Write a protein that binds this ligand. Structure first.
Ligand SMILES: OC[C@H]1O[C@@H](O[C@@H]2[C@@H](O)[C@H](O[C@@H]3[C@@H](O)[C@H](O)O[C@H](CO)[C@H]3O)O[C@H](CO)[C@H]2O)[C@H](O)[C@@H](O)[C@@H]1O
Ligand SMILES: OC[C@H]1O[C@@H](O[C@@H]2[C@@H](O)[C@H](O)O[C@H](CO)[C@H]2O)[C@H](O)[C@@H](O)[C@@H]1O
Ligand SMILES: [Ca+2]
Length: 394
């Protein structure tokens, strides 16, 4: 339903929908602030549903699920020249651990989205974004600061949830819409046992194919160096329709933020060169326009920004307040942003294409394809270049 050789993914994440991310929907978390004191604000969806209790969590999430993304979104996405969406969902949509605080109901909207994608000629990856015990300790796994996906029975539970996704979404009913099932969003390889992560990926690949599914398996790169996965899940071993998902940002350390704009573009170009050398099909499944980590709570609730020397002992570069609203941005920041977005587009189009993080946010413009487009900073059409050939690809 997709040509990974010939065609290029031009997509957005439907992030912040089935897995809450404080920086994406701060209004859902702000009511727990006591003036300027953020110490009472739930740091993730696990804590947010636990604090609210099941009734209120379901009331509030139903209102969110039903309005955050609708068919009109899919129409706009198509209108803008995009051909693809990546849809994060948490394991808890399918299975609760004993005593999980999460509420369910997301599958109804996932299924409405797959129909809206069909209606609008949009293809989809289903992405298991959060595993039990957390695979990365990010708030976007559902459970911040926990790293227990390989603890206890959590890997087996993650496999069982995958089997459910494989049966529901990897078969004939959606073979015109679903062009990938992603086994696990950003397992944080540096803190995990990679041998056990590889076995988990091989188990997921084998279970999906054993269902009769021909759907591509999307393996996230687990933060490994380019090429690390080249000899895993290979044609030589009869393991086929496998795509590696790489994520790329330059904002989550002091060193990467410190780069001048030319060096940020050189790094973006080099992602393209390096991805070209890889042996599997590969797509930049998450990236953004961000040159700063200024967005409120991007690093988590009750954490500041490295960009203004307020997190992680990073040195101060600049103040975040003027970068919060795209109408306060300097002409220099607007120009840096357009340059950066075009360079990443060119790099990611050099292999399988790209899936911007994310379609929309409440008020974080570096992370909103809609806001950036409406402000002329994301190319529209997406092939438009004000800064052509920054990378010199051949
Ligand atoms: O929280 C918002 C945003 O988080 C994104 O995930 C990032 C991780 O990708 C990131 O990984 C870092 C790298 O970007 C960088 O190059 O190297 C350092 C190591 O020195 C990495 O830590 O880690 C941060 C936490 O620091 C995560 O938030 C998601 O992809 C995005 O979808 C999410 O909305
Ligand atoms: O190039 C790596 C990808 O190769 C795929 O094998 C085949 C392609 O090389 C070929 O050109 O097209 C056929 C038809 O779809 C592919 O099977 C693997 O299947 C992929 O897993 C791999 O990433
Ligand atoms: Ca910089």
């Amino acid at each position: 339903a997709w040509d990974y050789d010939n065609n290029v993914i031009r997509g957005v994440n439907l992030g912040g929908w089935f897995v809450l991310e404080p920086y994406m929907t701060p209004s859902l978390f702000e009511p727990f602030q006591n003036g300027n004191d953020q110490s009472g604000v739930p740091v993730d969806e696990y804590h947010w549903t636990q604090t609210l209790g099941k009734e209120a969590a379901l009331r509030i999430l139903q209102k969110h699920w039903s309005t955050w993304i609708t068919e009109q979104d899919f129409k706009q996405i198509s209108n803008l020249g995009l051909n693809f969406v990546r849809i994060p969902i948490g394991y808890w949509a399918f299975q609760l651990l004993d005593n999980d605080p999460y509420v369910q109901g997301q599958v109804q909207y996932l299924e409405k989205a797959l129909g809206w994608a069909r209606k609008n000629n949009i293809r989809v990856w289903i992405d298991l974004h959060g595993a039990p015990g957390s695979q990365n300790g990010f708030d976007n796994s559902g459970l911040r600061d926990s790293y227990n996906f390989q603890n206890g029975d959590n890997t087996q539970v993650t496999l069982n949830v995958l089997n459910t996704i494989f049966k529901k979404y990897g078969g004939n009913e959606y073979s015109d819409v679903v062009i990938g099932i992603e086994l696990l969003n950003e397992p944080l390889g540096p803190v995990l046992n990679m041998d056990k992560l590889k076995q988990f990926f091989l188990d997921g690949y084998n279970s999906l194919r054993q269902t009769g599914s021909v759907t591509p398996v999307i393996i996230h790169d687990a933060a490994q160096v380019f090429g690390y996965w080249n000899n895993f899940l290979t044609v030589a071993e009869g393991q086929w329709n496998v795509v590696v998902d790489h994520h790329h940002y330059q904002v989550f350390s002091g060193g990467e933020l410190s780069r001048n704009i030319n060096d940020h573009i050189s790094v973006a170009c080099n992602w393209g060169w390096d991805a070209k050398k890889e042996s599997h099909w590969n797509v930049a499944g998450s990236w953004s326009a961000a040159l700063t980590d200024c967005a409120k709570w991007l690093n988590g609730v009750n954490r500041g920004a490295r960009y203004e020397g307020a997190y992680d002992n990073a040195p101060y570069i600049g103040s975040c307040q003027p970068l919060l609203d795209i109408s306060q941005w300097s002409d220099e920041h607007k120009t840096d942003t357009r340059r950066y977005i075009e360079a990443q587009l060119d790099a990611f189009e050099y292999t399988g294409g790209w899936v911007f993080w994310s379609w929309k946010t409440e008020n974080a413009p570096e992370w909103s394809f809609q806001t950036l487009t409406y402000n002329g900073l994301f190319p529209q059409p997406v092939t438009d270049r004000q800064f052509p050939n920054q990378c010199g690809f051949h």
